[PDB]
Enzyme design. Structure first.
Site, mmCIF file in Angstrom:
data_model
loop_
_atom_site.group_PDB
_atom_site.id
_atom_site.type_symbol
_atom_site.label_atom_id
_atom_site.label_comp_id
_atom_site.label_asym_id
_atom_site.label_seq_id
_atom_site.Cartn_x
_atom_site.Cartn_y
_atom_site.Cartn_z
ATOM 1 N N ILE A 110 0.950 -1.066 -0.042
ATOM 2 C CA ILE A 110 -0.081 -0.038 -0.199
ATOM 3 C C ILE A 110 0.936 1.343 -0.114
ATOM 4 N N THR A 114 2.762 10.663 -0.629
ATOM 5 C CA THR A 114 3.826 11.328 -0.161
ATOM 6 C C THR A 114 5.125 10.758 -0.699
ATOM 7 N N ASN A 115 5.418 9.574 -0.620
ATOM 8 C CA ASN A 115 6.648 8.901 -1.255
ATOM 9 C C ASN A 115 6.132 7.708 -1.995
ATOM 10 N N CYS A 246 7.608 11.647 6.079
ATOM 11 C CA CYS A 246 7.045 11.533 7.269
ATOM 12 C C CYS A 246 8.128 11.998 8.230
ATOM 13 N N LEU A 419 8.353 3.389 8.488
ATOM 14 C CA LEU A 419 8.873 3.412 9.994
ATOM 15 C C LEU A 419 7.722 3.008 10.843
ATOM 16 N N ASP A 487 20.106 -36.319 68.757
ATOM 17 C CA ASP A 487 18.858 -36.662 69.572
ATOM 18 C C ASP A 487 19.473 -37.001 70.912
ATOM 19 N N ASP A 519 11.108 -38.143 62.715
ATOM 20 C CA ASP A 519 10.197 -37.267 62.030
ATOM 21 C C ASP A 519 10.246 -35.846 62.451
ATOM 22 N N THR A 597 24.986 -42.472 62.095
ATOM 23 C CA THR A 597 25.155 -43.547 63.152
ATOM 24 C C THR A 597 23.876 -44.407 62.716
ATOM 25 N N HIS A 723 9.205 -43.768 47.902
ATOM 26 C CA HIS A 723 9.333 -42.711 48.806
ATOM 27 C C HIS A 723 8.267 -41.831 48.900
HETATM 28 N N1 LIG Z 1 17.658 -37.348 52.808
HETATM 29 C C1 LIG Z 1 17.750 -38.554 52.918
HETATM 30 O O1 LIG Z 1 18.883 -39.214 52.104
HETATM 31 C C2 LIG Z 1 16.739 -39.270 53.036
HETATM 32 C C3 LIG Z 1 16.293 -40.531 52.171
HETATM 33 C C4 LIG Z 1 15.167 -41.364 52.641
HETATM 34 C C5 LIG Z 1 14.320 -40.837 53.580
HETATM 35 N N2 LIG Z 1 14.953 -39.859 54.576
HETATM 36 C C6 LIG Z 1 14.513 -39.614 56.027
HETATM 37 O O2 LIG Z 1 15.258 -39.914 56.952
HETATM 38 C C7 LIG Z 1 14.497 -40.225 58.310
HETATM 39 C C8 LIG Z 1 14.946 -41.448 58.745
HETATM 40 O O3 LIG Z 1 15.715 -41.112 60.100
HETATM 41 P P1 LIG Z 1 16.510 -42.461 60.721
HETATM 42 O O4 LIG Z 1 15.227 -43.392 60.349
HETATM 43 O O5 LIG Z 1 17.666 -42.546 59.597
HETATM 44 O O6 LIG Z 1 16.725 -42.509 61.993
HETATM 45 P P2 LIG Z 1 15.588 -41.611 62.799
HETATM 46 O O7 LIG Z 1 16.041 -40.285 62.371
HETATM 47 O O8 LIG Z 1 14.134 -42.009 62.499
HETATM 48 O O9 LIG Z 1 15.699 -41.556 64.514
HETATM 49 C C9 LIG Z 1 16.145 -42.826 64.989
HETATM 50 C C10 LIG Z 1 16.097 -43.239 66.128
HETATM 51 O O10 LIG Z 1 16.716 -44.329 66.464
HETATM 52 C C11 LIG Z 1 17.527 -43.947 67.589
HETATM 53 N N3 LIG Z 1 19.041 -44.002 67.144
HETATM 54 C C12 LIG Z 1 19.538 -43.415 66.347
HETATM 55 N N4 LIG Z 1 20.848 -43.843 65.852
HETATM 56 C C13 LIG Z 1 21.052 -44.676 66.894
HETATM 57 C C14 LIG Z 1 22.055 -45.618 67.186
HETATM 58 N N5 LIG Z 1 23.289 -45.454 66.684
HETATM 59 N N6 LIG Z 1 22.103 -46.441 68.144
HETATM 60 C C15 LIG Z 1 20.926 -46.668 68.818
HETATM 61 N N7 LIG Z 1 19.730 -45.981 68.516
HETATM 62 C C16 LIG Z 1 20.042 -44.873 67.613
HETATM 63 C C17 LIG Z 1 17.082 -42.727 67.980
HETATM 64 O O11 LIG Z 1 16.267 -43.082 68.826
HETATM 65 C C18 LIG Z 1 16.649 -41.939 66.792
HETATM 66 O O12 LIG Z 1 15.640 -41.177 67.293
HETATM 67 C C19 LIG Z 1 12.979 -40.202 57.714
HETATM 68 O O13 LIG Z 1 12.370 -38.959 57.997
HETATM 69 C C20 LIG Z 1 13.088 -40.513 56.402
HETATM 70 O O14 LIG Z 1 12.079 -39.532 55.777
HETATM 71 C C21 LIG Z 1 16.018 -39.269 54.350
HETATM 72 N N1 LIG Z 2 5.976 5.973 8.489
HETATM 73 C C1 LIG Z 2 6.041 5.813 7.259
HETATM 74 O O1 LIG Z 2 6.686 5.184 6.767
HETATM 75 C C2 LIG Z 2 5.348 7.032 6.611
HETATM 76 C C3 LIG Z 2 6.001 7.563 5.265
HETATM 77 C C4 LIG Z 2 5.325 8.589 4.630
HETATM 78 C C5 LIG Z 2 3.902 9.009 4.886
HETATM 79 N N2 LIG Z 2 3.451 8.277 6.019
HETATM 80 C C6 LIG Z 2 2.046 8.834 6.204
HETATM 81 O O2 LIG Z 2 1.453 8.365 5.055
HETATM 82 C C7 LIG Z 2 0.047 9.332 5.371
HETATM 83 C C8 LIG Z 2 0.234 9.868 3.867
HETATM 84 O O3 LIG Z 2 -0.919 10.428 3.519
HETATM 85 P P1 LIG Z 2 -1.676 9.372 2.378
HETATM 86 O O4 LIG Z 2 -0.823 9.822 1.227
HETATM 87 O O5 LIG Z 2 -1.319 7.884 3.210
HETATM 88 O O6 LIG Z 2 -3.161 9.573 2.222
HETATM 89 P P2 LIG Z 2 -4.238 8.597 2.685
HETATM 90 O O7 LIG Z 2 -3.729 8.462 3.959
HETATM 91 O O8 LIG Z 2 -5.640 8.713 2.181
HETATM 92 O O9 LIG Z 2 -3.813 6.903 1.954
HETATM 93 C C9 LIG Z 2 -4.788 6.183 1.722
HETATM 94 C C10 LIG Z 2 -4.210 4.977 1.014
HETATM 95 O O10 LIG Z 2 -5.072 4.022 1.765
HETATM 96 C C11 LIG Z 2 -5.264 3.065 0.883
HETATM 97 N N3 LIG Z 2 -6.165 2.017 1.310
HETATM 98 C C12 LIG Z 2 -6.228 0.816 0.957
HETATM 99 N N4 LIG Z 2 -7.368 -0.057 1.539
HETATM 100 C C13 LIG Z 2 -7.690 1.034 2.264
HETATM 101 C C14 LIG Z 2 -8.931 1.282 3.322
HETATM 102 N N5 LIG Z 2 -9.670 -0.007 3.517
HETATM 103 N N6 LIG Z 2 -9.340 2.348 3.824
HETATM 104 C C15 LIG Z 2 -8.298 3.538 3.419
HETATM 105 N N7 LIG Z 2 -7.333 3.538 2.738
HETATM 106 C C16 LIG Z 2 -7.065 2.106 2.138
HETATM 107 C C17 LIG Z 2 -5.469 3.710 -0.606
HETATM 108 O O11 LIG Z 2 -5.149 2.764 -1.681
HETATM 109 C C18 LIG Z 2 -4.379 4.927 -0.412
HETATM 110 O O12 LIG Z 2 -3.106 4.507 -1.010
HETATM 111 C C19 LIG Z 2 0.654 10.454 6.237
HETATM 112 O O13 LIG Z 2 -0.266 9.897 7.502
HETATM 113 C C20 LIG Z 2 2.074 10.122 6.588
HETATM 114 O O14 LIG Z 2 2.420 10.771 8.009
HETATM 115 C C21 LIG Z 2 3.972 7.338 6.625
HETATM 116 FE FE LIG Z 3 14.877 -43.879 52.160
#
Ligand SMILES: NC(=O)c1ccc[n+]([C@@H]2O[C@H](COP(=O)([O-])OP(=O)(O)OC[C@H]3O[C@@H](n4cnc5c(N)ncnc54)[C@H](O)[C@@H]3O)[C@@H](O)[C@H]2O)c1
Ligand SMILES: NC(=O)c1ccc[n+]([C@@H]2O[C@H](COP(=O)([O-])OP(=O)(O)OC[C@H]3O[C@@H](n4cnc5c(N)ncnc54)[C@H](O)[C@@H]3O)[C@@H](O)[C@H]2O)c1
Ligand SMILES: [Fe+3]
EC number: 1.2.1.10
Lengths: 869, 419, 200
Positions: A110, A114-115, A246, A419, A487, A519, A597, A723
């Site tokens: 279109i 102008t230009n 423009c 533009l 603990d 826990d 442990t 788990h």
């Molecule tokens: N991040 C991970 O790698 C991972 C993965 C899976 C599960 N978990 C979580 O780990 C937790 C399990 O905790 P746990 O079961 O390993 O121990 P726990 O923390 O249940 O506690 C174990 C209990 O056993 C006793 N105890 C602990 N160490 C002992 C020892 N050396 N001698 C005698 N008694 C002892 C203590 O009373 C202690 O409270 C759960 O919450 C589980 O969801 C962690």
């Molecule tokens: N930004 C730029 O790149 C740039 C450069 C030069 C000019 N301009 C702008 O262009 C305008 C120049 O005036 P004009 O010469 O565009 O007069 P105008 O705005 O009437 O342009 C009308 C144009 O619309 C076309 N057209 C197609 N379908 C249409 C529809 N459904 N309804 C209406 N028009 C339809 C017609 O064919 C005609 O070419 C100014 O606003 C000027 O700033 C912009």
């Molecule tokens: Fe586990």
């Protein structure tokens, strides 16, 4: 050949469409050559078209169009000649990306009055580089020129290796015809120009568009400007094509400091200040019927006044009217394409840009604005003029008519007519148009395997007699204030003096926190950070296992970042590097050396830290490699006096730590040999450690080392689904972890051990389900079945070894048998089958379970059954 | 007492490098140095990491002046550069010679006071070390990319260098100079020649075969060694013949070589790497090729239930080497049910010859380009100087200089090591 | 060829060098024009080699580690008093150079920069020129002698005869219009140390 009917159009388009399809198969050299010939043919024809443009348009001036018909060819070529727009633009081969840049199809141009010719040489010539086509719908006042501007381009392209109707034009235009072209189906885009009504009808067509509005172009001249060039450039921009172009500076906004000077400098150099009666008469002819007089456009100044009713020198370049109103009531501020100009009076800078933004906001929203100031010493003004002015082009110390079409005064700006004025104006381009807008990029995406890791705590130490050798290694050689977490059973029974005994005897200050029970809750954690924040430790230590090693490494968080909301710290994620609450870097205040442990947990290596909310009672396993213990320790002297239960539940969580880590989806060749070496030690030495106990310390040690080895496995190859439900099953009923994992693994294996499952995890590295095979590679590694088995017996024999192992450790066959009542299970089973799927452990299980499929292997365990599917 | 310590990050998959710098380097550093060899500066391998850093607020400098079997002259050269650019991070690349040279420049940059001779000092234990290495995380971290599949230097503290004066590779070692990050992506080895995929992927067979049997061997460093051995058996041949046409194998082997580093970093080497280092610095034989000729005898050496000596390690009560070498075969499938622990080794050694024949590996040193006159004349030198290497202080039978030479010669004449 | 450029390098260093010092980046045009001038002078002395100020400068700025430009600003205001003697001891023996014209050229300079008033006598145009330098060296932070520039009278007089014989041996001095004597170089080294002139 000619076009004045609606059918001739529907024919043209076809014989055009068919040129493109023949033109699209062209190479870069075969079109790099079409691009030159068409640009020369347009440059050598810079004069005549400029003649043919004034004879037909009635506006403009010759010598100023010639700068346009020539800029639209030379300055377009120098920029878009080397732009790869044919095939592969880029190829990142590390990744698998390739940008191929197929063309768009054919276009409707279109054109304005102008230009007329430049806008044709610019589109015509840029639509050949992208291997596109185009069809022009020109302005009646300039139909003969802009159509003579394409034949001068086409007839030079076909002569360079192109088809014969690639380009097309309408000779006798209308609305019925354009509106029939813009709505044509075989069209694929609209490249419009002509201001309002045009763009309002380009987009409204049904096709995409790069239509382009237009309007006022304020220019600000501040105290710290060069009023000399500020003015010359104002005139060199208006008189250029007589402002018809423009973007021309329809309104200046000067500050009082230099207004009078500017007022004169405009006068001497061809500025007639409309003082009184002349002004009104002049702002009366501008706007006709709410719009600007379509006869004043592009006409010279002295030819203005004649229509106004007065007269001025023929050498006047401009007509200036000093005014104050900045609204629509003043027609002297709208988009007058004439050489006229409005001169506003402002107190200071901020008062001007506030005024400019107000009159760009009326007719020229988004197009462009200008500023004249010290471009080097006043960068804040600039920063204040760009952040405040809603224009796609802010032109500092440049004239608009020759800076908006930008390759002359500034480079790095895409030279273009057409533009873009940004959505502010009603067009979603926001930039000077070019060929990369007439182009359909497209991206081939090769399968990339997702990156993995084998990250551990440095300084793992493991043998009998490794505490003092380790503390006096890296702790005492270093830190000075410690916080032992454990603990009571360990504080009471001298498991915690054995570690202070060594810190003391050196310069260290210990403080023990032993209010951790099985826990651990979030209340105990705070109470531990509430203490750490008082004692201010340089290091943190954690004994026992699980509860402490899971409450401490989180107390390590609240100590270094007490602003952490557990609600965000335990947010389930889909990937562990694309985390939405990235853990803070916490190794600065204190380290987190860890002792253990208890065998199974393996928390001394892994980022996992299971804790419960204490409000809902749901164990929220939270994970990140920022809370790794930083020098774990595993000494087997702290286990030899463990009871028979904790041994089982421990060594039996370790089994399900490796089992569902060798089969997991994140499994790798780093974490698959450790899982097995754990699973092969828990088979040779686990039963012994239960029955015999301290009497076989050789076994009590290996199991302790294995259960940690699994940590190396499931720290990197996350757990599965045993788990994700054992955490809930062990919370709604307070069943221990290891006891829950034992009542599920002999029914979860046969869940994941289906090669035709309902779902799958969607992990690139996971070609297909291997679990049924990845479980048999286990049995064969332990020694269950040597001779040529079906791969289904290797599993039955794997389970059998578990039912046998779960038997000689006192593990019950079911949950019903474990102290749970059918009335309390069936009721809150649907609740913890959903809260299991919503665990972070299950995102790595190969089968991506369905809530309807965890519930089943959750009842089949209560009743000691088998999930059969 | 023992340990299992590695970097706190080992990223590993095809396409991991940018995802290992877009992640960590730029999140913490803005001044980086890169160490590599010319083949990689030239062939566009170092601009695969400078591309991604410079795109961030990082300034790079590349020390592309490294040569195989690096010297102490280069190392001091890169420090001068490192002392001039003042990097916040070092990024070694290329595998081996660069990596073994960058983690020592890391030293001369943090602590230029050091004296190399106080680093190459053999010892009885790593804790009971006289020259306690200094702490190095304060000036600049140390990253370690790799472009070969045979070294494991990405993970291990070993840093083999040469004086440039005596010509004696000093496989010094300390965990204080382990990399903070290790990046092992197969994107960089897919186009690696065969002369390297063989030597490299065949040292790794030793990195793991004299680590599963070492005295410092532990449950931690036994499943990794094996997994480094079940992959070098099913994918190393394919990565040689098919080359880049089987990138999965050329990838798995690249991980294995590293997994073996996860082993021998914790469970030091045996004796094959002592005689190799001295036998490959004198005759300028590559690393992996010196290890492939000897390993098939060292086994015949360490596999003697009644040797002259053990290595005197508490955890090592009775000589178990003749046994470990069987669990190896029993794991790889070479073993048939109903064996006697004496054929499982034959079936193992048979798998090597079968594997050395199909990679282009000769059958002796004579075939490897070494003149009988240049060998026998200086054999007693590298046989006394192997005993003085730090690697041999971990193999399970404390070799005699009487017994090392005998296996040097039996590898020259392609003979065995009967006793 | 190398006379209009030298001058244009001199009419710009007079109208824009002071401003580029005080205003600095606040007058980038001057900080730019001066940058071009310095180069235009390179378009001159690349073709028409230097004289003697760059010989004594190089040796006087490598011994005492004085910068280049500061060794040239202390001497130039005397070398002129040296080369501007219509009856010197020697010429440089160049065919194109028939009679000593130096006392004249230094006048066309001033006559071009505006320092000269109509009705002069070719002896003040140089004074008006040297006056423009002091005026220019005072407003750039340039001292009035070498002593003020951080050089001890004992370290200078002890090694003056060295850099006075080694200046004569520099390639730059093989182009200045009066082939200096080692008798005459030292005298201007010292008169720049004690801030004195070079009467003769
Ligand atoms: N991040 C991970 O790698 C991972 C993965 C899976 C599960 N978990 C979580 O780990 C937790 C399990 O905790 P746990 O079961 O390993 O121990 P726990 O923390 O249940 O506690 C174990 C209990 O056993 C006793 N105890 C602990 N160490 C002992 C020892 N050396 N001698 C005698 N008694 C002892 C203590 O009373 C202690 O409270 C759960 O919450 C589980 O969801 C962690
Ligand atoms: N930004 C730029 O790149 C740039 C450069 C030069 C000019 N301009 C702008 O262009 C305008 C120049 O005036 P004009 O010469 O565009 O007069 P105008 O705005 O009437 O342009 C009308 C144009 O619309 C076309 N057209 C197609 N379908 C249409 C529809 N459904 N309804 C209406 N028009 C339809 C017609 O064919 C005609 O070419 C100014 O606003 C000027 O700033 C912009
Ligand atoms: Fe586990």
């Amino acid at each position: 050949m000619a076009v004045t009917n609606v059918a001739e159009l529907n024919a043209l388009v076809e014989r055009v469409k068919k040129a493109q399809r023949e033109y699209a198969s062209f190479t870069q050299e075969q079109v790099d050559k079409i691009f030159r010939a068409a640009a020369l043919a347009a440059a050598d024809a810079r004069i005549p078209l400029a003649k043919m443009a004034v004879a037909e348009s009635g506006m403009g001036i010759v010598e100023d169009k010639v700068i346009k018909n020539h800029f639209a060819s030379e300055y377009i070529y120098n920029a878009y000649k080397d732009e790869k727009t044919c095939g592969v633009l880029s190829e990142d081969d590390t990744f698998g990306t390739i940008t191929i840049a197929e063309p768009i199809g054919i276009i409707c141009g279109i054109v304005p009055t102008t230009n007329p010719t430049s806008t044709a040489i610019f589109k015509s010539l840029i639509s050949l580089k992208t291997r596109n086509a185009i069809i022009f719908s020109p302005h009646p006042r300039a139909k003969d020129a802009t159509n003579k501007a394409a034949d001068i381009v086409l007839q030079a392209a076909i002569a360079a290796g192109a088809p014969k109707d690639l380009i097309g034009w309408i000779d006798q235009p209308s609305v019925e015809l354009s509106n029939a072209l813009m709505h044509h189906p075989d069209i694929n885009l609209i490249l419009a120009t002509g201001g309002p009504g045009m763009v309002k009808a380009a987009y409204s067509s049904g096709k995409p568009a790069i239509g382009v509005g237009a309007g006022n172009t304020p220019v600000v001249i501040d105290e710290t400007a060069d009023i000399k060039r500020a003015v010359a450039s104002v005139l060199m921009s208006k008189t250029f094509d007589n402002g018809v172009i423009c973007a021309s500076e329809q309104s200046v906004v000067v500050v009082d400091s230099v207004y009078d000077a500017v007022r004169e400098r405009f006068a001497t150099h061809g500025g007639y200040l409309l003082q009184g009666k002349e002004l009104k008469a002049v702002q009366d002819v501008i706007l006709k019927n709410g719009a600007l007089n379509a006869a004043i456009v592009g006409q010279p100044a002295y030819k203005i006044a004649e229509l106004a009713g007065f007269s001025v020198p023929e050498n006047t370049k401009i007509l200036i009217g000093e005014v104050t109103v900045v609204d629509e009531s003043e027609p002297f501020a709208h988009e007058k394409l004439s050489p006229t100009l409005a001169m506003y009076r402002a107190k200071d800078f901020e008062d001007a840009v506030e005024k400019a933004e107000k009159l760009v906001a009326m007719g020229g929203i988004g197009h462009t604005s200008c500023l004249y100031t010290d471009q080097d010493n006043q960068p804040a003004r600039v920063s204040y003029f760009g952040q405040k002015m809603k224009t796609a082009r802010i032109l500092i110390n440049t004239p608009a008519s020759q800076g908006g079409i930008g390759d002359l005064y500034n480079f790095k700006l895409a030279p273009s007519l057409t533009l873009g004025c940004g959505s502010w104006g009603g067009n979603s381009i926001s930039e000077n148009v070019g060929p990369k807008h007439l182009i359909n990029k497209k991206t081939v995406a090769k399968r990339a395997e997702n990156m993995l890791w084998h990250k551990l705590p440095k300084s793992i130490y493991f043998r009998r007699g490794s505490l003092p050798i380790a503390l006096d290694e890296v702790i005492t050689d270093g830190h000075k204030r410690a916080l032992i977490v454990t603990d009571r059973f360990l504080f009471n029974n001298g498991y915690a003096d054995q570690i202070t005994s060594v810190l003391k005897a050196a310069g260290v200050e210990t403080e023990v926190f032993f209010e951790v029970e099985a826990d651990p809750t979030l209340s105990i954690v705070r109470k531990g950070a509430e203490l750490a924040n008082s004692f201010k430790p340089d290091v943190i230590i954690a004994l026992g296992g699980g509860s402490p090693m899971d409450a401490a490494k989180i107390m390590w968080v609240m100590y270094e970042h007490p602003e952490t909301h557990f609600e965000e710290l335990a947010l389930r994620f889909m990937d562990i590097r694309k985390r939405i609450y990235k853990f803070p870097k916490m190794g600065v205040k204190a380290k987190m050396i860890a002792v253990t442990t208890t065998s199974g947990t393996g928390s001394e290596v892994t980022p996992f830290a299971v804790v419960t909310d204490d409000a809902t009672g749901q164990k929220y396993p939270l994970a990140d490699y920022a809370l790794t213990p930083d020098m774990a320790i595993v000494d087997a002297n702290l286990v030899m006096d463990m009871p028979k239960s904790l041994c089982a539940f421990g060594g039996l969580d370790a089994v399900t730590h490796a089992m569902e880590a060798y089969v997991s989806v994140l499994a790798s060749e780093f974490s698959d040999g450790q899982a097995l070496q754990a699973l092969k030690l828990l088979k040779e030495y686990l039963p012994a450690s239960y029955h015999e106990g301290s009497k076989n310390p050789v076994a009590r040690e290996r199991v302790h080392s294995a259960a940690t080895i699994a940590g190396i496995a499931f720290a990197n190859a996350f757990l599965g689904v045993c788990h994700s439900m054992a955490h809930k099953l062990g919370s709604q009923f307070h069943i221990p972890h290891g006891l829950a994992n034992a009542l599920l693994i002999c029914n979860v294996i046969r869940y994941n051990a289906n090669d035709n499952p309902t779902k799958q995890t969607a992990f690139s590295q996971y070609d297909r389900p291997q679990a049924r095979r990845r479980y048999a590679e286990i049995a064969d590694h332990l020694g269950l079945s040597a001779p040529g088995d079906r791969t289904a017996a290797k599993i039955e024999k794997l389970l059998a070894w578990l039912e046998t192992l779960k038997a000689e450790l006192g593990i019950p066959k079911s949950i019903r048998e474990a102290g749970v009542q059918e009335a309390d299970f069936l009721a809150n089973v649907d609740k913890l089958s959903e809260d299991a799927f919503d665990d972070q452990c299950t995102g790595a299980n190969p089968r991506y379970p369905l809530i309807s499929e965890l519930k089943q292997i959750l009842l089949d365990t209560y009743y000691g059954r088998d999930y059969v599917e």
